[model samples]
Target chain A: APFFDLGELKLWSFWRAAIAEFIATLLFLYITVATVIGHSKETVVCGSVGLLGIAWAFGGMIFVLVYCTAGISGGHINPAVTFGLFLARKVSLLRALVYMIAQCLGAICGVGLVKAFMKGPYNQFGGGANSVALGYNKGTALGAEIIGTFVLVYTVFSATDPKRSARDSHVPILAPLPIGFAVFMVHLATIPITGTGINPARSFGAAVIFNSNKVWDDQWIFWVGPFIGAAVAAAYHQYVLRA
Target chain B: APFFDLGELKLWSFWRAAIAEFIATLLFLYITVATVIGHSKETVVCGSVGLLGIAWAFGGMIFVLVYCTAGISGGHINPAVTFGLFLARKVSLLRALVYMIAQCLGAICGVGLVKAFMKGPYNQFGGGANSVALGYNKGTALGAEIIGTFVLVYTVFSATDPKRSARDSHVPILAPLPIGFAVFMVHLATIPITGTGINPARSFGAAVIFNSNKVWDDQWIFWVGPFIGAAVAAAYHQYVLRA
Candidate 1:
């Protein structure tokens, strides 16, 4: 329970944490967007990394960020995740708010950096915005998001539950790997359905930068689906799985 | 130390364990090979699933198998893995030999099942055989297999080593996940070269069923590379990481 407790937020430490979040998000967006651009083109066919590659890129990025900041922060890189932990009573309300704000800021910074990098010939490269272009309508997108987030939050709760699995707490290094692979699996199944927006913050960042109505109009599904999924997973772990 | 002991082989449960391996292997091959035929030709054309998909398929199959049968037989699904355990003094020589035989037999049955199912339209499918056509020479294929196996074995040794980290043991369910993902990563990088054969049993099964000289010629690399890699990983775990 103490691990869940949020201590007094020293201004300096909070700022440091925020900066780290920004850097991590920037890296996450850059790699994910680059993969989309690199793999989506027709001329560069065969060289394209498909849904699995994009999934791995996202997972791998999160894996690196979780390791890099697990000591400073609990690594709530997604707003949905932070909200889920808060709702589950695993994190203090104030700390959850701070994390959410930091994550949003980080996402914006990440999108900004992506824009900066793709200013030239790469201008055609979108910021990996989530849309329902590839046979993924709103309802299907919502279902995919819900399923993806449910799996991710369930894994986090199960993997990090110290009392439930003592061996997992020792090998903290692998915490990120499984989380990453889960993302890979989700993408494998759902990439064709709404570009797989399991994180509201990720969706928001890309939508804001792209200034696109498509991503904006469909954004509510990302929040609603992930929130519901996270709530279900948290409840499941707390009640059924956490013996 | 008792956990690695293979004394259970003397018990009647050993037969059931072997049977589980056979069944699991059959399912693994059936699902993965089916992907190549059913999906690869169309869904995976430009980037399709490529190496990443194949590797993930192999790894995902192993993950499911380990989760299903690890409690029964320690899930030595690969002969190379069994040999690695022997070198690590984890199993008796007789037990190791028994495991190898079971694994090979299981592999044969797995491929046979694939052949039976693919007899109609599936015959046009490749049956997921390993070859060196996509810009891969023998040496390159050998190197990829060796390195790929090294990462996989290293993950196994560390994941199962009770002394390395207490949390390592609690996540045995996840142990196969990473090994599978590592295989996916390897295939992502090497599929363009040698079709990715880090498991001799897998390669052999496909070759025997397909009756292809190309697969046979390249079979040596799968065995030699995986053996050397597993040996190196065992040594590394014992001496270097001491994990």
Candidate 2:
């Protein structure tokens, strides 16, 4: 009942929080997806940022967005992240629902902006869609997603823990570094496996816009794997690490 | 005497601080160099992390390390950083010297670990050594280093300034982030020229271990450029931003 109940739907900050999620995800997708597409372009591929740059785009943008918007919306930016927080009861049910909807919509629009602006690359590269890589089967892909999301959500919980806040609250850079670096580290290890979709909104946005048969077929892993991983992380933090 | 004076090195924390720098720089060079070396290997070059991944390795590692060690060593994993802070009088002459020595030594060992462990392609890729690219002249590479290090050190001075610390003491992720992202942004732009050696210790360590003629020949740019850039950043931040 507590998990399902939507609390404080009437608060004005609730609307603001949802709006922040929308704008933040929109911006996140725009910069990162554009980067992925841009890096994949043939001419620039010679000196492109490659897996490293795309990781930075995903990680760096999250660093900046979280720096700016964390106070306003908690800056989840991903449905799975928001869902993770939701399971911990860090966010209310209605807030989680609205945030996820806003994120997915923002992601779609963000990809749309990439499609509209970088029409050439969008057409050629399918707007940075996440799909299973050449040799990896669904089981391998699912394992990668699960482990990657575990690292992310676990870092998220640790970074924002009250104990860290208590010890280094004066340091001011303690909170976001691990969160962003977790994303970076995950991408580094998993990019070859399944294109590393620890974030459901990121994958869904690109897949929806790319509209490719293969990406769509493999899309369920992105959603299901992250959710499973996030749930595990929430339980781990509350029961083991935090306990 | 003032420049030569080592300040109070008898404190219990002094040895701890030096050890922190040693470990931090070691970890920094290890993760970052491995990323660069790994990214450049042929088998996975098609979808390598490339410049972006190398940048993340540098920045993300800095972010994590600084979050843990700033209270101990001010998190100066680079000689240029310690130099910049020393010039600004943020650190004592002795503190700067010891930190630099530890940093460079740590960097060497870090790269050494890579060489010793990842023997297959570590030697082949020249230990991720820095140098001028195909069309770029030494001057251009030098300029890139100066500007890039300036951005990095300037960010360092500003982020760690008491004023920012005063306001953002509660936020806690504000300090090391700009510093790390500055590193990330610099790498994204300058990786084509000189392999983005904004930290001399980074370049020097790799060059020493790589033991190549060209690396030693061009090593002056890595040291001189970062020092010049750091001096400028310190002066600019103190005169303009602080004034």
Candidate 3:
């Protein structure tokens, strides 16, 4: 019923959803980026957690968030997701814009907290920024980002489509888990290539503070790739899948 | 509607669903256990797929089977899962027994086929049997199995719980993906400990073929651990979570 009423976005409930997204994103970044810092060479290295660990970290964070907030906000925790939903007419432009800003703000706060935690001797580990230094050129990195985002958004569309699956009620809870796992799977295949930049906000927040030098140079790719991927997925869901 | 109608079990549709489960489980084992033999030292040593590969192989197989059979059969591909569902009162005892027999028969057929394929020099691999030589004592092995099964059954309950999340419909499509990943994750952490016997049938089939003296000696732990864990998870769902 809440979803049926577009005017509901103007109410206090919508803001609550936005706040939940912000908090969730903050948790996601803190856990994911901190794992990198925590597993650095200087620290305890018995079980490095490695690429697999990072992938699970992202996936588990989303799973937890989706379980916690799907009822309240529809759990569009990413800006590109908000954009895609808006394009699909699932969300209003105002709600989508508000969600995007809140997600970015939440991410900024998350990275800032990581900075606060790692201020002293731990400062050497640059807060898990996405960059091309990991055997990727900007173009290649952008391509990988696009592909990763496409898979993620495609998954979102398929998982959330109400008409196609009769058990539409379960989508929100399981949605985050698979989206997280898909991110993990994508990272598993792409981290060695591009450090895995499926979420532009994820890349941007860390890039802004940590790799300020040429960070913006590659920023466009992150934005372009995810937006395009989300749009494609939205169109696929709306038209091809009749979802 | 089918789920609500207990009398529907007498219908031909129910029998078809049971057959689907059998076929799905058989296919799942064939592909996944093949990884172990295919990657054995006699086959492809360096590319042996290792513990992680085996885990993913099993997980991916489950994911695929669940997708194919979820709508028709509820995708209880393992006897333990059927038992858990019965214990939770989500399924009838008679139906659970039927499902368990179907699953076990499927497992036997799968392992038998694998044995047939490995009749030559490959008999040394013996269809990827679960054993304790992987460095796990009975108590430790049981503990690992219990914990591993606990996590799995818990995920199943949570993922399928209608009141908990909207992603339930998508569970059939992607539920096995996470369950599989969970198996992969557990293997990553526990393979060195118990060869990861979260499923009793998996252990039983291998032990039956291997005929190894120690296999029978330590077999009870696998059964006890998993069933206990399954019971615990059912209780958690019915009581604590009220799922």
Candidate 4:
């Protein structure tokens, strides 16, 4: 229950957990960002992955990455996810800060790799940066990001709840699935609004590599919105749902 | 373990489970078909749900319906799923037959309701029926269905495996998520190829209501492919993966 457990710094598994977050976030950004750019380049309606495929890549990668990393690191590949878990007292302050740092670095490296591999398409497609789309004001975009992240963080809490596991044998096996689906469902709803940035790492990663004023100007929405959404989800799950 | 056990008929829960499958399948078809028709009717590329939204509708409904009905009926909302589980001896012969019958009846009712509500759109859009697309031959369509169903039934076995649940606390909670995602992922890949008929009940229901020669001609591919695919998945999990 302690928030400032500095003793974890001496543990080998602690460093390994952070390393897993870095690698998982890196891989998540590499695959999903590439998908977004690829879909954007498609000339025909169904020539490439399209929006459906882009959403699948985002959701499917989360499922695979979380399943691979959950045992080792609790699979907080997003900084917003780490923030929410921290608010819920699921992780120590030390662990939360380290995980977030690793996640952001991993995401930056991931997008950088995407840029390296497909420089032409990546540049042409705005590096898959999450910006507020045309016709939507910043307020609507911010609200979309908040609600999207809330769905994601809330599912993460519910899927990992110990009470649920004790009640049903089916509750734990697919814990990562609902978390991933939360990502997919949110993307389906909000991708048109804000390019769907429920994860700050994902948005920040692309913006760093893209380095455009347009992406930079609206970057705060991704961070502020997800943080607020995660905080609210944490409170709701711990106090309202559990009560 | 008896495959032909008819004792299920004597229990109230057996009928209750069948009823769950019926209602779940009905609702699944209702929502997913409407989304497909709605997308088809969209004039703009991003208007309405689009193909991405259609995939979400299919995947999301499966997740919600399975989560709701898994406790009561094992959530075999599709005949292909019931067929696969039966091959694995997860359900008795009597129970399997009942579930499939309930599912098909429910699916038919679901599509009929869709047509009744929007008769003009229903007729205009071909009732969202599944058929071999223009560029794909029957063999290719059949292969897509087989592999798609294989992915789905394979996930079902993996998610529900008692051994995995015993090994990791995370496996059981998100079991339905992967099953739903399998649907989502397959739809993304094969939607263009076959309009994605991994579920026999879904294809059959639409065919019955649409009552078109074109749909009937390709109906065997849905049934034969899924049954074969489910059989392979059952063997692979019970023998290869487990062994």
> Which candidate's lDDT is highest?
4
CAPRI category for model 4:
incorrect
Highest DockQ scorer: 2
Listed in order, each prediction's TM-score against the native is: 0.57, 0.56, 0.55, 0.57
Q: For each model, chain A TM-score?
A: 0.86, 0.90, 0.87, 0.92
Q: Which stretches of candidate 2 lie over 4 Å from their true place?
A: A1-177, A186-243, B1-10, B163-174, B241-243
Report how far residue A164 has shifted in candidate 4, in Å: 13
Residue range A138-241, candidate 4, lDDT tens digits: 87678767766876776677567454321111112226776787677667656656788999999999999999999999999999999998998788656433
Residues B1-243, model 2: lDDT tens digits: 265333353455566567767866776786677666657664744568656566777777777666545655667788998888778776677777878899999999988866764566788887888998899999999999999999998888777746332111111122667788898899999988888998988898999899999889999999999999999998998888562
Minimal lDDT window, size 10, model 1 chain A: A165-174
Candidate 4 lDDT at B200 equals 90
Write one digit per residue (lDDT tens) for candidate 2, span A61-116. 88888776666777688888888877876666766788899999999999999999
Each model's lDDT comes to 0.64, 0.76, 0.64, 0.78
lDDT of 3 at A6: 43
Query: Which window of 10 residues has the lowest lDDT sum in candidate 4 chain A?
Result: A165-174
Least accurate 10 contiguous residues by lDDT in model 3 chain A: A164-173
* Candidates 3 and 4, the one with greater DockQ: 4
What DockQ does each listed candidate score? 0.11, 0.15, 0.03, 0.08
lDDT of 3 by residue, B105-129 (tens): 7876787777788655346654466
| 1 or 3, greater by TM-score | 1
DockQ of 4: 0.08
Q: Candidate 2: give the TM-score of chain A.
A: 0.90
Q: Once model 3 is optimally superposed onto the true structure by TM-score, how far is the C-alpha of residue B239 displaced, in angstroms?
A: 3.0
For candidate 3, give the lDDT of residue B134.
38
